[PDB]
Amino acid sequence: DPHFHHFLLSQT
Amino acid sequence: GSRKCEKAGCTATCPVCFASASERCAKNGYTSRWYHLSCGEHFCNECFDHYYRSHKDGYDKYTTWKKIWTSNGKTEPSPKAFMADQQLPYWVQCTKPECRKWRQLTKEIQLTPQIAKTYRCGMKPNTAIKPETSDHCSLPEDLRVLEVSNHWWYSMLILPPLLKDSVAAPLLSAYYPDCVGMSPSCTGMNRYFQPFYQPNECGKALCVRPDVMELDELYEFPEYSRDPTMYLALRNLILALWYTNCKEALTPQKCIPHIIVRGLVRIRCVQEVERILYFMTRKGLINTGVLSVGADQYLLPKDYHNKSVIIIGAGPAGLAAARQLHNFGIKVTVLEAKDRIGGRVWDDKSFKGVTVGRGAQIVNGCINNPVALMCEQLGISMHKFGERCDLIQEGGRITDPTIDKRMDFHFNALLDVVSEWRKDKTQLQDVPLGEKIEEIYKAFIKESGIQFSELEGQVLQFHLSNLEYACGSNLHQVSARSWDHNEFFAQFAGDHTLLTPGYSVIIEKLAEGLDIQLKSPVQCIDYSGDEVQVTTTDGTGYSAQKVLVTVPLALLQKGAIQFNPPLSEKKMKAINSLGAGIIEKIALQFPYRFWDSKVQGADFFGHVPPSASKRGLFAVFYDMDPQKKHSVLMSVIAGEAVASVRTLDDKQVLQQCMATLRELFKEQEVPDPTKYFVTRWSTDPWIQMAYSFVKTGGSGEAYDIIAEDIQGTVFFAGEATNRHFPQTVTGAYLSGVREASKIAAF
Amino acid sequence: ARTMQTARKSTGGKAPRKQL
Ligand SMILES: Cc1cc2nc3c(=O)[nH]c(=O)nc-3n(C[C@H](O)[C@H](O)[C@H](O)COP(=O)(O)OP(=O)(O)OC[C@H]3O[C@@H](n4cnc5c(N)ncnc54)[C@H](O)[C@@H]3O)c2cc1C
Ligand SMILES: [Zn+2]
Ligand SMILES: [Zn+2]
Ligand SMILES: [Zn+2]
């Protein structure tokens, strides 16, 4: 669920 | 009778009991069963019984603990769990730099932060006997210590470690402690720091789940995806300590006394905390903001240091990446077109007792906002905006509540149906937001025909204009489909504030000590060779292994920088699908505060527009002194009105603003302004814009496409590369932090 | 974007609120 993810820890 | 561990694969050839509880303890001998905690830690069946059996002397201790455990934790209470929580001896590391050996503390000594901080080999309590002359640091280290750093040691640890007295605990009481790597038998931070998600919470920006690993955490530590407990606990502990003291570099030395858990696993915990720290550092979660180092104490291991980057543009994105990379130990040069740093941050300090931004000055949502963190680090206060914004008509009359409430209802209902209409539409079917709103509004008066008064129409115009301010564009150019695309992602929660000292204070501190070349517009970037060659407009050459471009969207659109090889047609299509929005500001100093009577403390007031075409001409006025002593108003020019203003000189713009203010305050004389500015961002050659928005036919995906690095060599940051957080200083800063992490890894 | 608004924030048109 991409709404919640931390911006800096979802850069794959 | 057995000398063999119950556990297949255990490397212990000689099991010893660590418990030594029962009078009949097997010690290093024979027992019906050896219970396996880890490869270095077992206990005998006699000590098992001591605690587990009703007739035995430890049953009272066990059941007392067991009840506490059962009403706090989610995990089944076991003699093993008990042993690991309560009986396993503590291991601590020697503080001497030349020694650093791990030692087991005797069974009854409880480890504390103070002991960990100061421990030395063979440290005993106070004694009257003269100490033996021996050297305890030369004593051989227990062979079991070596084994802990082997990948397989952890795979044979039965129960994950559970931290005691974790600084993160107070923030996590809503969760089962054992589920976040904390011991169920346990137990003044800036209100903008809310690093942990809470049950039933809505999405908010820069928030981590304390019980779930993020995607990049899974990627970097795949060995913890099946058992995330230890990682979670340490990461949570690291975030708790950073926010507890964001004015210092958080180091393994300062994390260690805060890791308190029994057994050899503590060795493993302190080994890992180091790697998790550097990861969190590289990623921009900690040891970040305006922290400086300064002068030779870099934030990432030397392994990262041998690499060089050129950053183009010294706005917030450029300086954020430059600050990070410099702090990492990486070599950084920045090239800036203009004769100053800051880009769209540019503060006027010449007003009496107040700082006024010609560009950015508001923080939109301070919770977990890196701007809020940076204010903490600098000891800067921010003024939280109050809610009240009265809609004042020309001339003087404050719009009545029922009229105000009614038209607010109707404006938002039009947006509801825009949202309903777009639901199954493709890019090719997109229409301008302004056109779509008009379409629904017309069919609304038709279908119901509920004529609005002229004033009701104008109040509606105020809301339309407020959207043009937000987008930096006339509504006829903004995408109905995509205008608010970013809200798909969790946004910054909580207060909007006025940054009273101005963003330039942050800009200046970020730049402090960096190599920044001013009046150096880049004209060409060649990434055809072994490293990149960058050439300024006067022919000066610079070279580095990596290049980061952070120039404004409008400049990418103009193609002012030649890329060799050229950018992909896909990148260019993204680049041209986004709008380069614009607003301008006027600021005005007066002899005294003439609005105080009617405005009554409100941070701003609204201006009901006389007609649609003028709706963007000073829709809102901002009172630039929170203390309410000085007299400075700021206002904004937006939408169709910015075009109406580009051929007007400053005096004319000023006359129109004064005409407006005099209409708004017709029930009195308003003094002439004694000082002022009018901005011209639109025609500033190296900027040419205020902030991006999505044009009709466009997609939020354009942000990601522009952000795409090229061959791990050419990188992109800037507000128009941040899909979650477009437009803002915070989004630009975060895009720079994002890129510095990508650049440091490559 | 809507997130730029401070005074008089619009509210209509928002996706259903997402919870944990
Ligand atoms: C009037 C106005 C009001 C604003 N209000 C707010 C607000 O209240 N809140 C908010 O968060 N944001 C606000 N902003 C938005 C904001 O300031 C930007 O989003 C932010 O500054 C963007 O940072 P950046 O690093 O991406 O780009 P920039 O700040 O534009 O920095 C870019 C730098 O690149 C340089 N450049 C261009 N070409 C070259 C080249 N060839 N070589 C070298 N350098 C080059 C530029 O000169 C510039 O210094 C406002 C902006 C404007 C204009
Ligand atoms: Zn025993
Ligand atoms: Zn074993
Ligand atoms: Zn020692």
Side-chain angles (χ1 to χ4, degrees):
Chain A
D1 186 12
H3 174 89
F4 289 92
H5 301 162
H6 195 292
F7 175 80
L8 293 179
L9 297 176
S10 317
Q11 299 299 319
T12 80
Chain B
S2 167
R3 295 250 57 248
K4 195 171 297 173
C5 176
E6 71 191 327
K7 166 84 171 164
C10 182
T11 52
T13 57
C14 186
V16 301
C17 189
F18 61 77
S20 45
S22 175
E23 275 301 320
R24 276 269 167 76
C25 175
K27 303 286 186 169
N28 65 351
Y30 286 78
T31 177
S32 45
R33 191 160 182 177
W34 277 109
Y35 292 92
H36 176 97
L37 247 40
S38 73
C39 283
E41 292 153 331
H42 310 73
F43 59 97
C44 67
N45 188 76
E46 265 292 314
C47 290
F48 179 94
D49 286 338
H50 179 90
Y51 295 107
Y52 185 75
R53 305 290 173 165
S54 74
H55 58 275
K56 302 282 191 170
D57 278 16
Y59 191 74
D60 272 9
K61 219 217 151 124
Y62 180 64
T63 43
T64 300
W65 168 96
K66 175 171 171 168
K67 148 256 164 181
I68 301 187
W69 193 272
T70 322
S71 51
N72 260 78
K74 195 261 192 59
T75 58
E76 332 231 342
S78 71
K80 280 183 175 204
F82 171 75
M83 296 305 271
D85 187 36
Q86 297 299 319
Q87 305 302 329
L88 244 190
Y90 280 105
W91 293 74
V92 62
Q93 204 175 0
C94 174
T95 280
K96 288 200 179 183
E98 57 276 18
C99 168
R100 298 295 291 152
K101 300 180 175 197
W102 280 95
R103 323 246 76 147
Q104 182 181 197
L105 295 169
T106 82
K107 188 209 158 178
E108 94 294 354
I109 302 181
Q110 315 290 300
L111 185 57
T112 65
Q114 186 56 38
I115 301 165
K117 259 151 192 155
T118 51
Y119 180 82
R120 306 225 163 179
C121 288
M123 227 176 51
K124 275 183 167 181
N126 187 13
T127 189
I129 90 152
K130 288 163 176 170
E132 11 123 334
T133 29
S134 316
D135 171 39
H136 300 275
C137 289
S138 67
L139 280 159
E141 191 184 64
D142 187 307
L143 295 173
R144 292 172 295 172
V145 167
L146 256 31
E147 293 184 334
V148 185
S149 47
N150 289 312
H151 175 96
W152 52 258
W153 188 92
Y154 187 73
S155 91
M156 278 189 294
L157 209 214
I158 304 313
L159 301 170
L162 293 176
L163 301 194
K164 300 190 187 298
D165 299 322
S166 172
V167 180
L171 313 175
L172 306 176
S173 53
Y175 299 89
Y176 281 132
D178 41 351
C179 290
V180 293
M182 304 192 308
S183 172
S185 85
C186 277
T187 70
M189 200 199 322
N190 182 313
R191 84 196 94 100
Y192 293 136
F193 297 163
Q194 302 177 18
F196 300 121
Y197 267 123
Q198 306 290 343
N200 298 335
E201 262 213 68
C202 278
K204 69 177 160 208
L206 307 195
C207 205
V208 305
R209 284 232 250 178
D211 54 326
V212 180
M213 288 176 85
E214 301 283 326
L215 298 179
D216 295 3
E217 292 175 311
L218 271 341
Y219 185 87
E220 183 79 16
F221 302 92
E223 71 277 27
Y224 296 131
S225 26
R226 175 181 219 80
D227 307 293
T229 300
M230 180 179 55
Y231 175 82
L232 257 9
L234 294 160
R235 173 256 260 163
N236 297 351
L237 170 61
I238 287 167
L239 293 182
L241 294 160
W242 165 244
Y243 287 120
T244 295
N245 191 8
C246 59
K247 297 194 205 169
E248 267 185 344
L250 184 64
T251 70
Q253 195 218 263
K254 26 188 51 70
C255 287
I256 290 175
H258 281 107
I259 298 153
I260 297 293
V261 54
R262 314 183 108 106
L264 288 160
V265 69
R266 171 165 196 273
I267 304 184
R268 177 56 92 94
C269 289
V270 349
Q271 280 166 3
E272 292 296 73
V273 73
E274 179 157 357
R275 294 171 62 211
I276 297 163
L277 225 31
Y278 292 137
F279 174 70
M280 292 287 128
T281 298
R282 193 189 110 236
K283 286 279 180 173
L285 291 269
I286 65 168
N287 295 338
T288 187
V290 111
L291 186 71
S292 165
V293 68
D296 197 339
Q297 290 210 38
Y298 303 109
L299 299 185
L300 293 188
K302 258 137 182 176
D303 194 29
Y304 287 91
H305 304 180
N306 58 324
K307 112 157 51 172
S308 64
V309 1
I310 290 158
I311 296 169
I312 305 178
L319 299 167
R323 178 87 256 147
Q324 294 291 103
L325 290 171
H326 182 278
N327 287 352
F328 293 170
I330 298 184
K331 196 249 225 298
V332 164
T333 304
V334 19
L335 306 174
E336 164 57 44
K338 304 169 128 246
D339 71 345
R340 63 167 187 92
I341 66 180
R344 284 165 268 176
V345 172
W346 187 4
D347 292 338
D348 196 314
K349 294 142 191 290
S350 72
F351 291 80
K352 202 166 194 165
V354 112
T355 291
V356 184
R358 303 177 175 262
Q361 196 171 9
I362 289 172
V363 191
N364 313 109
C366 290
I367 286 166
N368 296 333
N369 200 304
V371 173
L373 169 104
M374 281 181 286
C375 292
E376 248 296 329
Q377 301 174 313
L378 289 161
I380 287 187
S381 220
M382 300 185 286
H383 171 79
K384 170 184 178 202
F385 287 111
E387 200 59 28
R388 175 154 107 134
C389 181
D390 291 350
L391 267 26
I392 312 174
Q393 307 151 37
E394 319 178 1
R397 33 258 284 183
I398 298 171
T399 300
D400 169 69
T402 89
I403 297 174
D404 185 20
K405 257 156 50 155
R406 168 171 314 124
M407 297 314 291
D408 182 294
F409 176 79
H410 283 103
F411 163 68
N412 289 293
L414 291 152
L415 293 185
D416 285 331
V417 39
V418 168
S419 245
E420 213 48 49
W421 167 90
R422 47 146 83 142
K423 251 165 184 173
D424 57 38
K425 302 295 190 302
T426 64
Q427 296 192 218
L428 288 178
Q429 295 172 285
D430 200 0
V431 302
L433 180 60
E435 185 181 307
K436 174 59 63 181
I437 291 184
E438 254 287 276
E439 186 186 353
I440 297 163
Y441 176 85
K442 275 186 197 165
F444 175 61
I445 309 301
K446 195 112 170 188
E447 178 69 290
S448 57
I450 175 196
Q451 214 108 117
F452 293 102
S453 58
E454 196 195 344
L455 167 62
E456 288 171 334
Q458 297 171 335
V459 171
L460 177 49
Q461 291 305 308
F462 169 89
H463 293 294
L464 262 9
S465 160
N466 207 18
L467 252 20
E468 299 185 318
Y469 158 72
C471 297
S473 189
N474 188 318
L475 288 192
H476 184 79
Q477 255 225 131
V478 341
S479 164
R481 286 184 78 253
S482 308
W483 76 274
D484 59 341
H485 69 91
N486 64 313
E487 283 171 278
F488 186 85
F489 306 95
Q491 294 300 312
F492 284 96
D495 297 340
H496 293 223
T497 60
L498 195 271
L499 194 44
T500 62
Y503 275 106
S504 58
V505 176
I506 289 173
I507 286 310
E508 282 153 357
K509 232 66 158 79
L510 288 170
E512 185 186 271
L514 308 187
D515 183 27
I516 311 174
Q517 302 295 315
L518 294 178
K519 295 182 78 101
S520 305
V522 167
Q523 170 144 70
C524 179
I525 299 180
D526 187 297
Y527 56 108
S528 241
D530 298 68
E531 66 182 35
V532 336
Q533 306 297 326
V534 176
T535 319
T536 59
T537 55
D538 76 13
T540 312
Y542 294 84
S543 67
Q545 300 167 335
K546 318 289 179 196
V547 63
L548 171 60
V549 0
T550 69
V551 311
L553 174 65
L555 276 293
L556 288 183
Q557 289 179 336
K558 283 299 205 306
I561 296 184
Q562 317 162 224
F563 290 82
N564 186 40
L567 301 179
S568 75
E569 167 200 338
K570 179 185 193 213
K571 274 193 168 290
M572 291 313 302
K573 192 182 187 191
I575 282 158
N576 289 303
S577 73
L578 285 198
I582 180 72
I583 57 169
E584 306 285 0
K585 284 185 166 169
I586 182 182
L588 295 87
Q589 191 164 245
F590 298 91
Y592 61 90
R593 302 170 48 89
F594 66 85
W595 57 90
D596 259 22
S597 303
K598 188 195 287 198
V599 166
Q600 299 172 326
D603 298 297
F604 26 51
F605 53 92
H607 160 210
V608 182
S611 70
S613 43
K614 309 259 279 174
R615 69 190 180 202
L617 242 205
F618 329 111
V620 177
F621 287 81
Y622 301 78
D623 180 352
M624 302 302 285
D625 189 6
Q627 303 146 349
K628 281 123 209 302
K629 149 177 63 186
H630 300 279
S631 41
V632 178
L633 289 178
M634 178 273 288
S635 194
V636 182
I637 306 167
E640 195 181 322
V642 328
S644 76
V645 111
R646 62 185 285 122
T647 63
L648 307 195
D649 70 9
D650 293 348
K651 133 258 173 88
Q652 300 190 269
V653 178
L654 192 260
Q655 289 176 327
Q656 288 181 15
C657 188
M658 288 307 308
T660 295
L661 278 170
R662 276 193 258 269
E663 293 288 358
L664 263 19
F665 300 79
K666 209 94 151 114
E667 26 48 273
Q668 72 194 274
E669 299 271 5
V670 351
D672 278 347
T674 66
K675 191 194 226 309
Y676 77 106
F677 67 71
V678 176
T679 63
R680 303 278 172 175
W681 295 107
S682 182
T683 53
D684 186 328
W686 301 112
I687 294 169
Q688 302 179 38
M689 68 177 298
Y691 37 66
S692 56
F693 66 97
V694 183
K695 257 162 62 200
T696 315
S699 166
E701 205 197 342
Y703 287 86
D704 287 330
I705 295 174
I706 304 164
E708 256 171 19
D709 79 86
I710 305 172
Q711 300 171 18
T713 295
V714 183
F715 297 77
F716 294 87
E719 59 87 5
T721 70
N722 194 327
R723 197 186 174 168
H724 292 215
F725 311 128
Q727 301 188 307
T728 60
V729 171
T730 289
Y733 172 92
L734 285 168
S735 76
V737 159
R738 176 199 63 216
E739 293 308 310
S741 179
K742 290 183 182 163
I743 295 175
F746 258 96
Chain C
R2 186 208 312 268
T3 39
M4 186 70 52
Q5 304 189 311
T6 294
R8 291 281 174 164
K9 302 180 181 70
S10 61
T11 56
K14 290 175 161 182
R17 298 104 288 254
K18 297 190 75 56
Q19 252 179 49
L20 279 184

